[PDB]
Ligand binder design. Structure first.
Ligand SMILES: Cc1cc2nc3c(=O)[nH]c(=O)nc-3n(C[C@H](O)[C@H](O)[C@H](O)COP(=O)(O)OP(=O)(O)OC[C@H]3O[C@@H](n4cnc5c(N)ncnc54)[C@H](O)[C@@H]3O)c2cc1C
Ligand SMILES: Cc1cc2nc3c(=O)[nH]c(=O)nc-3n(C[C@H](O)[C@H](O)[C@H](O)COP(=O)(O)OP(=O)(O)OC[C@H]3O[C@@H](n4cnc5c(N)ncnc54)[C@H](O)[C@@H]3O)c2cc1C
Ligand SMILES: [Cl-]
Ligand SMILES: [Cl-]
Ligand SMILES: [Mg+2]
Lengths: 299, 294
């Protein structure tokens, strides 16, 4: 029928750790901020979050909900559960078109839409993601309690992961024909106490048992993969933001002020070069939010 | 007593760093003197998840979560001297106690240095502040005084109308040049040039001639010093910023002295709790990585 027009100083696309941290700075600067969030955090798979001082061991859902409530306590902050499908530069800033068909208008944008894990094509793996199969050992290595750990090989980068893993438990480097250690490497692994298993993996079964092509089964307490990741949205590219290749996938380029190559568009969290954890998302999200405010004031 | 890492300073940056080292199953000791920079305010703001909580409760929660790891240790004390051995680092505390570590994380914070202005210091963290993102909102769009003190003061005053009607106070101690005069007027920032005798009531400025201007809050772009000379003792390169020195770090938060890392307000990109937690975590991970890969 009818509705009143709205205009936001900043719209934050993505409302998990990075976006909430950014939006909070803007809310505290008494500007109008909207978070549009599609409700699918990268960390929606594990039961606990670790490594963020003050939130260590808490449920990711509870951390997200507390942050949302704290932000929405500010009357100048608003939230929409929706997905931005198209971002357009306008004379008056930016227009966002969402999957619902709703449109929103902003002077500036903060991108905080996260990455999506692209898991190896291995039967049983995806079903155990965040339960017995993980990406980052600082996040989940401690809780393995010195047990048996499998490093699912995925190329050269898995070598360093294998070398690091004995900090947390008895490590087996399952190369899965993705990598063959040279002389130096084979010797460094042996010295580190890492066992190398070269046979192809057929599937993961039960909680965390690796079934090899030759029929062998090896039970693990946890498995790690250095998997690829992709940007969760084409919005950065739509806005003309420069995107660069990192070791494990693309990131949105940002400067010291978390600003992308497109003036007035900032980025934070996992989609930036130095993200990858909640602590970093909170930190650089705060930087992006303050930077976005400062541009509203000083251009 | 030998540790893999000793963290000097056990507030937000130190706890964040120590937590990564603890989670990496290494032996980490936090030595902390117990005087946080934010001990003066009743609430913290700006940290998602901790917004509006008392800084004391935030720090206590962090200490509890860190000490849940039996490989983390805590000592309330002050490190007075740090020495490099080839066998690591040796620390001497005010208590006389010695400690040894393969690596160090400096997280001892900075100390604010306020102008000698009668009434100002006792209102610090209550109605006199440094950071408007931290404490501007609660002034509820009322009147704000910015205490002038050099180039950064002008920029602060230019930003402050976001939070309320702003007055730039020179305290009769310098005149803005006409460039700065011009843009301030072009923001609705009044310049008051009178000598200030004292601060009274909440944040009321009382002039030498007795007249009063009632503000809801005052801001200062004050200088800061490093809390401790330990960074200098260890040969860590230190840079002067506009408002005070900071310990130089690279991308992994490592100082110029290998095996010594730094985080929090003592580094160039600190100044808030969100940043202390973020770069603390980096420093802790980096310290661990160096333990493993050298
Ligand atoms: C299994 C697992 C366990 C982990 N455990 C930990 C841990 O214990 N500790 C830790 O520090 N890190 C952990 N991580 C890392 C972690 O999850 C990230 O670093 C963190 O979530 C990133 O924050 P973010 O705000 O950048 O992105 P995200 O948390 O992924 O959130 C992005 C948000 O943007 C929304 N989005 C995407 N597209 C759109 C769109 N077009 N419009 C609107 N919204 C959109 C999403 O739905 C989502 O809600 C873990 C990761 C995984 C995979
Ligand atoms: C009044 C005020 C209000 C603020 N409000 C906010 C806010 O709302 N939100 C926000 O994000 N930031 C706020 N800040 C900023 C804030 O306090 C810092 O960003 C934060 O405290 C820095 O953390 P830190 O761990 O680096 O250092 P600190 O918190 O200063 O802690 C350093 C610790 O190291 C210890 N130390 C010093 N020397 C030694 C030694 N020789 N041996 C052992 N230990 C030592 C100290 O005693 C201290 O406990 C505020 C600051 C002030 C002044
Ligand atoms: Cl993970
Ligand atoms: Cl402050
Ligand atoms: Mg956590």
């Amino acid at each position: 029928s009818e509705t009143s027009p709205m205009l936001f100083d900043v719209i934050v696309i993505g409302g998990s750790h990075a976006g909430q941290s950014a939006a909070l700075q803007i809310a505290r600067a008494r500007r109008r901020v909207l978070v549009i969030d599609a409700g699918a955090r990268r960390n929606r798979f594990a039961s606990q979050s670790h490594g963020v001082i003050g939130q260590d061991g808490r449920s990711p859902d509870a951390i997200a909900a507390d942050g949302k409530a704290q932000l929405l306590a500010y009357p100048n902050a608003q939230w929409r559960e929706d997905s931005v499908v198209r971002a357009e530069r306008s004379d008056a800033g930016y227009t966002l078109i969402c999957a619902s068909g709703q449109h929103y208008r902003a002077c500036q944008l903060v991108l905080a839409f996260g990455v999506v894990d692209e898991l190896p094509e291995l039967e049983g793996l995806e079903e155990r993601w965040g339960e017995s199969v993980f990406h980052c050992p600082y996040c989940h290595g401690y809780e393995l309690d010195g047990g048996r750990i499998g490093v699912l090989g995925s190329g050269p980068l898995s070598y360093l992961s294998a070398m690091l893993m004995p900090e947390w438990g008895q490590t087996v480097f399952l190369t899965d024909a993705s990598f063959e250690p040279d002389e130096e490497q084979r010797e460094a692994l042996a010295r580190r106490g890492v066992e190398i298993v070269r046979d192809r993996i057929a599937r993961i079964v039960d909680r965390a048992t690796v079934e090899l092509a030759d029929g062998r089964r090896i039970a693990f307490d946890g498995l790690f993969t250095m998997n690829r990741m992709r940007l969760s949205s084409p919005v950065a590219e739509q806005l003309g933001c420069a995107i660069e290749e990192g070791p494990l996938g693309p990131y949105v380029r940002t400067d010291d002020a978390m600003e992308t190559s497109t003036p007035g568009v900032f980025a934070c969290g996992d989609i930036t070069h130095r993200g990858g954890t909640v602590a970093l998302a909170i930190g650089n999200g705060a930087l992006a939010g303050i930077a976005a405010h400062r541009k509203l004031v000083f251009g």
